[PDB]
């Protein structure tokens, strides 16, 4: 399937995905786990669009074919993901009964750009979302798929704690963190609490604010601790002398 000189790769691949999915549907004895991330992309349309029919009829001159394809851009209906050969295979296995050989443990991506009802133009230099999808369309696992919905939340404090501890400390041990500068940043507890507030315990948020911790301006702790340690040292030198 995938070993060929291009262009041949492109059709070989087509034939091959078809017959592969025909192989998997024909096998009843061997456990098969299919894991697809962001199923919600499969249950609606691709961002692809059907080619304007005039690409298919051939042409003489643009002067009079009575044709717009070169004049104005227009939108044609989206090509639903259920018309993708691969997804066609997967769906054919879900919907047909008599295949309890397979288990889809599958997931949803919410990854799209934010839209609040006004949208400016994204500043290209600073943007977190440039690689996100344009979707802006709502999705429910229940009505939009045949799988059984499970709901995942944010970390609770136990998870959150174990996780943050990992990132920070195991980070340092790998030499990826404050290191010799350790006295600059505050101690674990403080960080845990503060990152807690910033992220709201969301995992993506936790990772990100762990990084952004570098720039915290308003944390005073190491300052007052230093001050205290110092004053106690000098009281020790005044008790000695």
């Amino acid at each position: 399937g995938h070993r060929a000189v291009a262009p041949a790769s492109i059709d070989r691949q087509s034939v091959c995905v078809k017959f592969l999915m025909d192989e998997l549907s024909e096998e009843k004895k061997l456990p098969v786990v299919i894991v697809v991330d962001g199923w919600n992309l499969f249950s609606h349309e691709t961002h692809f669009r059907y080619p304007h029919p005039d690409f298919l009829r051939g042409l003489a001159s643009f002067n009079e074919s009575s044709t717009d394809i070169d004049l104005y851009p227009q939108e044609l209906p989206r090509i639903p993901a259920s018309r993708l050969s691969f997804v066609r295979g997967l769906n054919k296995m879900i919907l047909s009964g008599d295949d309890p050989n397979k288990f889809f443990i599958t997931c949803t991506t919410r990854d799209f750009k934010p839209f609040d009802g006004i949208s400016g133009f994204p500043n290209v230099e600073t943007d977190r979302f440039a690689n996100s999808l344009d979707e802006y369309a709502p999705y429910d696992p229940e009505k939009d798929s045949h799988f059984h919905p499970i709901q995942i939340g944010n970390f609770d404090e136990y998870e959150y704690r174990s996780f943050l501890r990992f990132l920070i400390n195991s980070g340092e041990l790998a030499g990826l963190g404050w290191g010799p500068l350790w006295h600059a940043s505050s101690d674990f507890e403080r960080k845990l609490y503060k990152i807690g507030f910033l992220s709201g315990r969301n995992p993506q948020g936790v990772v990100d604010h762990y990084h952004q911790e570098l720039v915290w301006r308003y944390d005073y702790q190491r300052t007052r601790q230093k001050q205290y340690l110092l004053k106690r040292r000098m009281e020790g030198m005044s008790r000695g002398a």
């Binding site: 290209v124 230099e125 600073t126 943007d127 440039a130 690689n131 030499g175 290191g179 010799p180």
Partner: protein
């Protein structure tokens, strides 16, 4: 200008590199970092970057910037002697060569 877009591309590249067992570009990068990140030494009293001498040109004059630009153009990072880069330098904070990095771990066992 480094864009988040570039960062995500960087991520996919780095992942894909990890999974193909390529240690090379990692080692190039590690060498670069080791060479140029060594902690700059404290300058001796009486060593400061020359200002532009007063009472030469009017305050609003182009000479100022010109002097700055040329002075900095004169000192290239190859000319920075206050940062200790070379084979001579001992680098207490870093690993020396490829052998000592985790992807070599099977040689570290007994």
């Amino acid at each position: 200008r480094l864009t988040y877009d570039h960062l995500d591309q960087l991520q996919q590249w780095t992942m894909r590199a990890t999974l193909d067992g390529r240690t090379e570009e990692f080692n190039r990068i590690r060498d670069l970092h080791r060479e140029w990140s060594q902690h700059p030494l404290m300058p001796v009293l009486g060593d400061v970057e020359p200002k532009f001498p007063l009472n030469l040109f009017k305050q609003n004059h182009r000479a100022k910037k010109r002097f700055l630009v040329r002075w900095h153009k004169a000192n290239t990072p190859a000319n920075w002697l206050w940062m200790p880069r070379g084979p001579t330098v001992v680098t207490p904070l870093h690993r020396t060569n490829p052998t000592q990095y985790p992807e070599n771990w099977k040689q570290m066992v007994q």
